[PDB]
RNA sequence: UAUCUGGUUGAUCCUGCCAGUAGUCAUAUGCUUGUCUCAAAGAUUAAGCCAUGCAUGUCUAAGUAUAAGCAAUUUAUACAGUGAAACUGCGAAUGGCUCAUUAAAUCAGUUAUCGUUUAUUUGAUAGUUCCUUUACUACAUGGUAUAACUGUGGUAAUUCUAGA
RNA sequence: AUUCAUAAUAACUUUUCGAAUCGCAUGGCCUUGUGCUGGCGAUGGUUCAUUCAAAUUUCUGCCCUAUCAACUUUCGAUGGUAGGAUAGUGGCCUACCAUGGUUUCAACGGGUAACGGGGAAUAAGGGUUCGAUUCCGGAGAGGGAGCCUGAGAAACGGCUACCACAUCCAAGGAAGGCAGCAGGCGCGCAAAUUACCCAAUCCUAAUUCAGGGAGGUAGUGACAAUAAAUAACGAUACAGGGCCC
RNA sequence: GUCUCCGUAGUGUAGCGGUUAUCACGUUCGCCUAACACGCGAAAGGUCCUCGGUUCGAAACCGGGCGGAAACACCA
């Protein structure tokens, strides 16, 4: 046998992300009955009985008390076709950077959409996250995705087709403007809390014939969400390139040294291999590697593997570095880089010295635009003007920008997953771009 | 290879081990070394024996080149050679084949795992399978 | 738990390391005998101090002493064997009158110069280290060998050396092949 | 330490074994037997380093297992058998009988004896007692117990054990004018004649043994071994016969041999 | 290789100390680093705490087998060839690591056990044990299980164990 | 030097040992029979001696302190008698009796960045300092106590209990002591691979065969030591040292 | 990693969305000697941590980033 893929999940607040995620993990051999029954008892004492499924991924004390997904969390389950692990996105404008960290380490995406009356209109609004989360997915390199219409029992009347067809029509109009073809995307009606149309075909809604997709590789037609998870295409894994794994976390595991963990964006990580973290500049050797409490020999691209360093320290190591083999061309600090970025509406004007929190890959940092080289056409890199005076919404441009804080970045031609980024300012996605050139240190 | 001139020294006789020991002195002028099969071949007719009856080890080439000192043994019979020559030299030339008994690590783990069970384990295997079938 | 190997330091640094008179003395000796490190002079002086101390301890004992006689002739025999002491000076008193130059003269570097095969002590050093010179039937590449009046007749070019016949050599072949191909 | 010790590092082994200090950190500790570990010679070292018949440890084991050597009539099969003084190893193959006799220098030797000489072994008795059932017995240096001995046999004499039958055939009394063999001490391996002795009834009896070259030395009575009368040795003496030349005489002997 | 020097004073001779000097199986660190041989290496503060994987098990010609294990006996009708597991007999108190405790204590040289134990070895060492000892009793020879194994199983777990 | 070894008397034992074990080759006598004799061995066994040991013990010797001068004996201290216990001598313990024993010739008490020694550095000699660390003799398995088995343990890679730690829990319960080999955290100026092999040196078992992180090999390694590259040799342009014209 | 308290010349550190300044120390400058010294006579010294908005207008209104000052977390 079975392949390995990686999914992330996204959506508006109270759309039922963690409820749909956790209950789907329960159905597909995630945890036994006494573990989730314990979670029902503890959450009933807290007062949040509905969040018992959401608790499975939301393990922190502040998350369970508030009933809010603050930071991302990992959990695996084996489908009929292959292995897969989920990224539980926050779904808040407060924790939008944590979503960007999670979606950047994801191949596919499960866009959870609320079906209840009033909640869908709030989700796809100016202030809502349904517009933002779908836009941020295509920005970071999630080419293929799936949309899931949640809370079919909540809407009035219950399990009403007109409501499902209205949501699919409303999403299809918006999702074309982002870039995703809604013909290739599958639309599945589900209920996360009830557990309806996720594993087995639903009895409450016989009206639903079945979703369908029309790709170049192969067509698929499934009844449930689980079959739609099987129909996701195997991504292109660049195994031959130099390693470029931006670290995720660095743990000090009991009786086995320091253990750096991160997805192999490019290359093959293995035990007994020296690595260099980019911004801090710390060289160290890995003791061993693991993925969801299971050891590995070869950490292939797109994997939740986690090396472990040695002969150094947990502080020398850090979330954000690139273990480019100390033997191969390692990741270096970027003083200034040529990174085009197109913008998605900055309320203020974008001139110079403007340092938005560039969230290239898993790292967010303020970057000040040294200047603007050329005003460029919206596509094909066509040069329109030489040396602009200012820039506005709905316009492309190449721009050289200096970070206000030590950051590691790389060109799009060398590393496609590394080269993607977005821009944020005034609590909104002001611009989106890709880096073509970069000056090393 | 040229003017090998295999000259033997300190020849001794052991009817105890049915072998004769001798420090073999070999000179290799203008040539690097003499292969082990090379000295064994002409060791056969000087002692009037066969190729598969002699044993030589050592052959640390003298510094500067042109001389090598090693220690050699000759066995009377094939069966005597089997029962006296150590196994590592037997598999070395052509005399036997070294079977891989996995390695030391897995053998130790298997021994400990077999130590954790008291008996053959056929009844234990069927009992745990029946109990853990569900 | 194996028995540890024995190691010893074979040189003694001077107590006064900063003195013009001694500094020029070793520079003259090193240049005349072709020595790179002055530790080589430190080493050879250390051996002189040891044998002088041993010989001095022998001279405080009476004549016809089994300990003095046995070790006395053994040290004398070794010295006359290696060639630092002449045959008519075997009286255990000239042993205390040995100098560094006498020991330095017995080094194979100086003997190669003396027999006339290097034309310069520095050229003897490169000949020593490039394996173009052998002792007896053995190639020696150590400048300090201390021939002992018996192998001095055996000092000659090694059979496996371009200078003493044999295969012409490395840079010669590259030049010979270059000119042969140019002329062909 | 909580019981006996079965190990011998290759630094505390007796120095007369002539073992190196680089081939392994352990030494072939002799098993319990007729002689003490510090006064005997294991069969492994004797066959590997003295006779050079065997190279490795397993070669000695293979030779021993094949029923070839015969120590004191018995074949024996232990690689660490403590063969000491007055031990005869008989080899059916190679037609050699070897006798363990100390040398002048302070080690063992490879003295070869005829088949007739290997039929008898000299033994110095240590204790004479009246055992159970009233039977007298003697305790030789090798620990052999011989019942019903000659009444004239007392402490500190030597008997000629028949080995094959284990019976006493001849006894040599300890008195002045007796050729002896020093076993143990800084004066071990010397052969000389007894002139007198100071009794010293407090322990450690001393005897003044005089060499054939008028050299006299003092050795405790526990380290002596009478091997015959004056001028007639009951045993074939090793080469040199314990002249004990000085370092000067040895050097001239070497220079007269090379 | 039994060696000194600089510094109190305007200047001198002393006492006197500081500093310089050389070495360290005395370490730590810095800069640099091409080769051959040999080779120390979690002692100093923490004898502070440990994930995980190993570190002692074992048979011959010769203790016990019908593996309902494996080849072939054809010299073998009871096996008698090889031989897991188990019972049994030994070993596991050796080795390895550390220097916490301890200042006539340990330990070193040196005595005694005529004041004791001693597996394993080595050399020797039980004509006398049927007790109204003539029927009281097999002595070309006695009795009793039990493990492995077959099957029933229990606990979430253990080198966990029961009943037949 | 013995009430020593040993022997014999009169008894004591609920009674120790005095072969119901095993492998090969199977041979001789004839009163011609599963009749009677018969070898080379292994295992075990009571006692003695010996050996590998173990445990006590004679004499001498250990750092700094008197801003430690008296210590020990309540409830063991010194010695004697007798008895228990020990494998043995013995206040080792008990009952009684006597009041002794050590000390300025440095007792006793305190500190020790104190296991001791063989040894290491340093020097003419004298000596000073260090010595955990490859060898020998000791102590410990986190701090103590107790015990089975076995010749031998007061054993911890054997158990039992308590305290301080700490692991798995479907909350009843169960499993542990890396100052063993690697490796992890902490500590600090300060110290290596979670590798390979029983090929050597040995040890153990029933035993030639098997096992051994004992050990050896490799890797990290500028702790310390040995030797030793990085340059030499001709001809030309100058500048010389004796000397020839 | 999440959450909270502060950030202001050189040291001090005030002070207050239509506007950043003060105070001592200091920092220099004319002062004398020979250099001084005290004695003195005068003036050089802040993107209000960074970015982005709110903004007629902000450092202060708000939020993001960093720095420091405090917490709780962090079994591939």
Swiss-Prot record, chain A:
The modification N6-acetyllysine is found at residues 162, 169, 270, 389, 436. The modification N6-methyllysine is found at residues 33, 162. Specifically inhibited by didemnin B, a natural product that triggers ribosome stalling by preventing aminoacyl-tRNA (aa-tRNA) release from EEF1A1 on the ribosome. Inhibited by narciclasine. One of its GO terms (biological process) is cellular response to epidermal growth factor stimulus. This is Elongation factor 1-alpha 1. The modification N6,N6-dimethyllysine is found at residues 33, 52, 162. The modification N6-succinyllysine is found at residue 389. It comes from Oryctolagus cuniculus. Residues 2-239 form the tr-type G domain. Belongs to the TRAFAC class translation factor GTPase superfamily. Classic translation factor GTPase family. EF-Tu/EF-1A subfamily. Residues 67-71 are annotated as: G2. It is an enzyme of class 3 (hydrolase). The keyword Protein biosynthesis applies. One of its GO terms (cellular component) is cytoplasm. The keyword Heme does not apply. Found in a nuclear export complex with XPO5, EEF1A1, Ran and aminoacylated tRNA. Interacts with PARP1 and TXK. Interacts with KARS1. May interact with ERGIC2. Interacts with IFIT1 (via TPR repeats 4-7). Interacts with DLC1, facilitating distribution to the membrane periphery and ruffles upon growth factor stimulation. Interacts with ZPR1; the interaction occurs in a epidermal growth factor (EGF)-dependent manner. Interacts with PPP1R16B. Interacts with SPHK1 and SPHK2; both interactions increase SPHK1 and SPHK2 kinase activity. Interacts with guanyl-nucleotide exchange factor EEF1B2. InterPro entries: EFTu-like_2, G_TR_CS, GTP-eEF1A_C, P-loop_NTPase, T_Tr_GTP-bd_dom, TRAFAC_GTPase_members, Transl_B-barrel_sf, Transl_elong_EF1A/Init_IF2_C. There is a cross-link at residue 382 (Glycyl lysine isopeptide (Lys-Gly) (interchain with G-Cter in ubiquitin)). The modification 5-glutamyl glycerylphosphorylethanolamine is found at residues 298, 371. The modification Phosphoserine is found at residue 297. The gene is EEF1A1. The modification Phosphothreonine is found at residue 429.
UniProtKB/Swiss-Prot annotation, chain B:
Residues 101-134 are annotated as: Disordered. GO terms for biological process: cytoplasmic translation; maturation of SSU-rRNA from tricistronic rRNA transcript (SSU-rRNA, 5.8S rRNA, LSU-rRNA). It is found in: Cytoplasm. It comes from the Eukaryota. The modification N-acetylserine is found at residue 1. N-terminally acetylated by acetyltransferase NatA. Also partially acetylated by NatC. Coiled coil: none annotated. One of its GO terms (cellular component) is cytosolic small ribosomal subunit. One of its GO terms (molecular function) is structural constituent of ribosome. Gene3D superfamilies: 3.30.70.3370. Component of the ribosome, a large ribonucleoprotein complex responsible for the synthesis of proteins in the cell. The small ribosomal subunit (SSU) binds messenger RNAs (mRNAs) and translates the encoded message by selecting cognate aminoacyl-transfer RNA (tRNA) molecules. The large subunit (LSU) contains the ribosomal catalytic site termed the peptidyl transferase center (PTC), which catalyzes the formation of peptide bonds, thereby polymerizing the amino acids delivered by tRNAs into a polypeptide chain. This is Small ribosomal subunit protein eS24A. It comes from Saccharomyces cerevisiae (strain ATCC 204508 / S288c). The gene is RPS24A.
Curated annotation (Swiss-Prot), chain C:
It comes from the Eukaryota. Disulfide bonds: none annotated. There is a cross-link at residue 179 (Glycyl lysine isopeptide (Lys-Gly) (interchain with G-Cter in ubiquitin)). It is found in: Cytoplasm; Nucleus, Nucleolus. GO terms for biological process: maturation of SSU-rRNA from tricistronic rRNA transcript (SSU-rRNA, 5.8S rRNA, LSU-rRNA); ribosomal small subunit biogenesis; translation. GO terms for molecular function: rRNA binding; structural constituent of ribosome. The modification Phosphoserine is found at residue 183. Residues 106-180 form the S4 RNA-binding domain. One of its GO terms (cellular component) is nucleolus. Its main location: cytoplasm. Keywords: Cytoplasm, Isopeptide bond, Nucleus, Phosphoprotein, Ribonucleoprotein, Ribosomal protein, Ribosome biogenesis, RNA-binding, rRNA processing, rRNA-binding, Ubl conjugation. InterPro entries: Ribosomal_uS4, Ribosomal_uS4_CS, Ribosomal_uS4_euk/arc, Ribosomal_uS4_N, S4_RNA-bd, S4_RNA-bd_sf. Residues 159-184 are annotated as: Disordered. Belongs to the universal ribosomal protein uS4 family. NCBIfam families: PRK04051.1, uS4_arch. Present with 106000 molecules/cell in log phase SD medium. There are 2 genes for uS4 in yeast. Component of the ribosome, a large ribonucleoprotein complex responsible for the synthesis of proteins in the cell. The small ribosomal subunit (SSU) binds messenger RNAs (mRNAs) and translates the encoded message by selecting cognate aminoacyl-transfer RNA (tRNA) molecules. The large subunit (LSU) contains the ribosomal catalytic site termed the peptidyl transferase center (PTC), which catalyzes the formation of peptide bonds, thereby polymerizing the amino acids delivered by tRNAs into a polypeptide chain. This is Small ribosomal subunit protein uS4A.
From Swiss-Prot, chain D:
This is Small ribosomal subunit protein eS4A. Present with 573 molecules/cell in log phase SD medium. There are 2 genes for eS4 in yeast. Belongs to the eukaryotic ribosomal protein eS4 family. GO terms for biological process: cytoplasmic translation; translation. Component of the small ribosomal subunit (SSU). Mature yeast ribosomes consist of a small (40S) and a large (60S) subunit. The 40S small subunit contains 1 molecule of ribosomal RNA (18S rRNA) and 33 different proteins (encoded by 57 genes). The large 60S subunit contains 3 rRNA molecules (25S, 5.8S and 5S rRNA) and 46 different proteins (encoded by 81 genes). HAMAP family: Ribosomal_eS4 (MF_00485). Coiled coil: none annotated. GO terms for cellular component: 90S preribosome; cytoplasm; cytosol; cytosolic small ribosomal subunit. The modification Phosphoserine is found at residues 31, 246. The modification Phosphothreonine is found at residue 114. It is found in: Cytoplasm. It comes from Saccharomyces cerevisiae (strain ATCC 204508 / S288c). Keywords: Cytoplasm, Isopeptide bond, Phosphoprotein, Ribonucleoprotein, Ribosomal protein, RNA-binding, rRNA-binding, Ubl conjugation. There is a cross-link at residues 61, 133, 160, 167, 173, 178, 210, 232 (Glycyl lysine isopeptide (Lys-Gly) (interchain with G-Cter in ubiquitin)).
